[PDB]
């Protein structure tokens, strides 16, 4: 039922869980004690580039979904690349990761080939957070609490100006 904590996410039965269970699966911590964390950074209002209409629908959908999967969701809006970095650094230091088995990172903004655009981005003065930086801030060195634990990064953004298509005759 949708009235529960899992919402619209189809539940895994105990018979299904044993059917999957092998030594090639990530371990899941006890539901009673675990403190799962997730972070959504969504840029909607920008200084130079047009407003991202419908971003609130994405925030709602992603926030609810990750909560349904058992993650406590922090939502941060309209940040620069420097502010995103600071927020990522703060997220990596959260003590709850030690009593968590995994994490989800969601980035939603305008994007170019180099990376994700901050709120202050323009072609004159770039304000870009690179994917490489996200990985570095969340790796074993900078985030030892999530060692051996799945780190899922989701990015909604353009990666260039091209339509991504070619023509062919049938």
């Amino acid at each position: 039922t949708s009235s529960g904590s899992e919402g619209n996410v189809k539940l895994c039965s105990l018979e299904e869980a044993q059917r999957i269970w092998s030594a090639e699966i990530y371990p899941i911590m006890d539901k009673s004690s675990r403190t799962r964390l997730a972070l959504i950074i969504c840029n909607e209002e920008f200084d130079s580039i047009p407003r991202r209409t419908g971003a609130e629908v994405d925030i709602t959908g992603m926030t609810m979904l990750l909560q349904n999967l058992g993650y406590s969701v922090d939502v941060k809006k309209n940040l620069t690349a420097s502010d995103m970095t600071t927020e990522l650094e703060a997220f990596a230091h959260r003590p709850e990761h030690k009593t968590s088995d995994s994490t989800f990172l969601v980035f939603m903004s305008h994007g170019i080939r180099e990376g994700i655009c901050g709120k202050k981005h323009s072609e004159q003065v770039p304000d870009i957070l690179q994917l490489n930086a996200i990985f570095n801030m969340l790796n074993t060195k900078n985030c030892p609490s999530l060692k051996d634990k799945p780190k899922v990064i989701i990015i909604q953004a353009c990666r260039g100006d091209s339509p991504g298509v070619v023509w062919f005759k049938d």
Binding site: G54, V57, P150, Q156, A157, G160
Partner: peptide, 23 residues
Amino acid sequence: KDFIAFCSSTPDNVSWRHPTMGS
């Protein structure tokens, strides 16, 4: 280790977002 990234499109290419329905 233990990373996975999922991007909305391929490199160089656009990602679409409906103004009312979302991305």
